Amino acid sequence: NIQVVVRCRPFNLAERKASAHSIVECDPVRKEVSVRTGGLADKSSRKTYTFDMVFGASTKQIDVYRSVVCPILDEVIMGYNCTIFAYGQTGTGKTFTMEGERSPNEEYTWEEDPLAGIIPRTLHQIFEKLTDNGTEFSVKVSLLEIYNEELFDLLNPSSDVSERLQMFDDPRNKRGVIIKGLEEITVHNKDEVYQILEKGAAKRTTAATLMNAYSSRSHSVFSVTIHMKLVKIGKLNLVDLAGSENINQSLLTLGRVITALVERTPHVPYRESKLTRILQDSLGGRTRTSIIATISPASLNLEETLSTLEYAHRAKNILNKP
Ligand SMILES: Nc1ncnc2c1ncn2[C@@H]1O[C@H](COP(=O)(O)OP(=O)(O)O)[C@@H](O)[C@H]1O
Ligand SMILES: CC(=O)c1cccc(C(SCCN)(c2ccccc2)c2ccccc2)c1
Ligand SMILES: [Cl-]
Ligand SMILES: [Cl-]
Ligand SMILES: [Cl-]
Ligand SMILES: [Cl-]
Ligand SMILES: [Mg+2]
């Protein structure tokens, strides 16, 4: 049963200057979000949904990590496969949630930065857990991106981002695919990390000057494979999806895969897109998923917010087999 959580961000300045009202209420204890749908017309209308965890505008980066990821990180160290993806409207915080930011000036080190998000926190903590256990581990990471249904490789040594990968069926495996051409960097220890992400960032920046609406329109899959010793392999995909408001084929297919999965029909159209193929095992496969849905408090965003909470809620019905 894929775990589904909801995080809502603080108003931004733009919103504040617009005198925006909040339409969203977060009750952690009841694990409920409930939205105020009636406007000036009906003041009592509300839509209310129940999720596995709920995180409010107040919620800090460390709280998301603590609640969502450690339980997750603990089953990859046990040799099981774990996806976490971020779903929602452009502007609502899925990048801030999977990656995070760096606090102005210095004031902090990437390892301790408050605005640090999941990927930095997970990577960083995969050694302090495995190093302190004094066992054998090798961790490697890869980061690709889907745009207009073409795969690009942000970690590749090639100096040019626009060189495209290709995908074929794993010669031995049913639900997996192989990405032909995809660089996988070995990460030897904590101090190699920032360096890699900083390079991924730079290539990502170039990608944005090259392609239209690259940030909002593109999917990003950061994978982390861990090797342990009989040997055990843990593997964690951290997926930051394109905006849900939205060439978009991978997003459609994603909907249709879910929708087919919960209505239980015979052919789930995984194949009909790139993302659903890379991610096939994460939807009704043997991977243990989570979906952090991402929403905004403002009244302006109401229609989109329900749309998210609706979509995210159905997903609670999808059943895996780890
Ligand atoms: N939980 C949060 N706390 C503080 N600021 C946030 C939060 N979520 C988003 N923001 C800010 O809102 C803006 C949009 O965030 P971003 O992650 O780029 O959205 P998305 O990636 O889903 O479009 C950024 O300025 C980001 O810093
Ligand atoms: C792929 C990528 O760019 C990335 C992935 C995870 C974290 C980070 C950043 S945040 C990227 C923009 N959202 C970062 C690294 C290097 C320079 C600037 C930022 C990161 C921030 C804080 C702690 C570690 C890493 C970046
Ligand atoms: Cl709240
Ligand atoms: Cl911190
Ligand atoms: Cl094939
Ligand atoms: Cl339902
Ligand atoms: Mg984003």
From Swiss-Prot:
- State where the protein is found: Cytoplasm; Cytoplasm, Cytoskeleton, Spindle pole
Residues noted as binding ATP in the record, renumbered to the chain = 88-95
N6-acetyllysine modification sites?
129
What does the PTM comment state? A subset of this protein primarily localized at the spindle pole is phosphorylated by NEK6 during mitosis; phosphorylation is required for mitotic function.
Residue span(s) of domain Kinesin motor? 1-318
Which top-level group of life is the source organism from?
A: Eukaryota
- Describe the family membership recorded for this protein in Swiss-Prot or TrEMBL: Belongs to the TRAFAC class myosin-kinesin ATPase superfamily. Kinesin family. BimC subfamily.
The record's function comment reads: Motor protein required for establishing a bipolar spindle and thus contributing to chromosome congression during mitosis. Required in non-mitotic cells for transport of secretory proteins from the Golgi complex to the cell surface.
Q: Which disease is it linked to?
A: Microcephaly with or without chorioretinopathy, lymphedema, or impaired intellectual development: An autosomal dominant disorder that involves an overlapping but variable spectrum of central nervous system and ocular developmental anomalies. Microcephaly ranges from mild to severe and is often associated with mild to moderate developmental delay and a characteristic facial phenotype with upslanting palpebral fissures, broad nose with rounded tip, long philtrum with thin upper lip, prominent chin, and prominent ears.
Instruction: Give the record's subunit note.
Output: Interacts with the thyroid hormone receptor in the presence of thyroid hormone. Component of a large chromatin remodeling complex, at least composed of MYSM1, PCAF, RBM10 and KIF11/TRIP5. Interacts (via C-terminus) with the kinase NEK6 in both interphase and mitosis. Interacts with RARRES1 and AGBL2. Interacts with TPX2.
| Record's protein name | Kinesin-like protein KIF11
Natural source organism: Homo sapiens
